[PDB]
Design a protein around this ligand. Structure first.
Ligand SMILES: CCCCCC/C=C\CCCCCCCC(=O)O
Length: 130
């Protein structure tokens, strides 16, 4: 999953609104989130990762070590417990909370494919390298 490193910007999104409804995001925040075109900046050093997700207004930062659970507060304010793993080319972010989510990032054809899963919802957000 080493190629995930660098800076990325949203290029396409499918079913993000349904993902947001499923994790309980309110209408006002969903409208703002759907209207955003975020960047992700990903740094990797060994099993040390950080990811900064930015819009012009609001940023979130997380840092973690592969395999080691950490406390995370999502952009929408949910408190969760997250453990990140590597499965081949993908880094998978297993988020435990109310509800659980699984977020995977994998580079395919030079684009970062992010897949956000909650219940039976599958959201796909594709990012291009900046
Ligand atoms: C992520 C911070 C800016 C938006 C604030 C949170 C709004 C809605 C919750 C979105 C879920 C967070 C996952 C976004 C993944 C991404 O686009 O990179």
């Amino acid at each position: 999953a080493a190629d995930l490193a660098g800076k990325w910007i949203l290029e396409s999104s499918e079913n993000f609104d349904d993902y947001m409804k499923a994790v309980g995001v309110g209408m006002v925040m969903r409208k703002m989130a759907n209207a955003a075109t975020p960047t992700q900046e990903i740094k990797i050093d060994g099993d040390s990762w950080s990811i900064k997700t930015s819009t012009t207004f609001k940023t979130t930062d997380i840092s973690f070590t592969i395999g080691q659970e950490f406390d995370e507060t999502t952009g929408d304010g949910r408190k969760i417990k997250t453990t990140c793993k590597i499965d081949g080319n993908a880094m998978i972010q297993d988020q435990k909370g109310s509800p659980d989510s699984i977020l995977s990032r994998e580079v395919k054809d030079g684009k970062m494919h992010m897949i956000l899963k909650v219940n039976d919802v599958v959201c796909t957000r594709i990012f291009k390298r900046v």
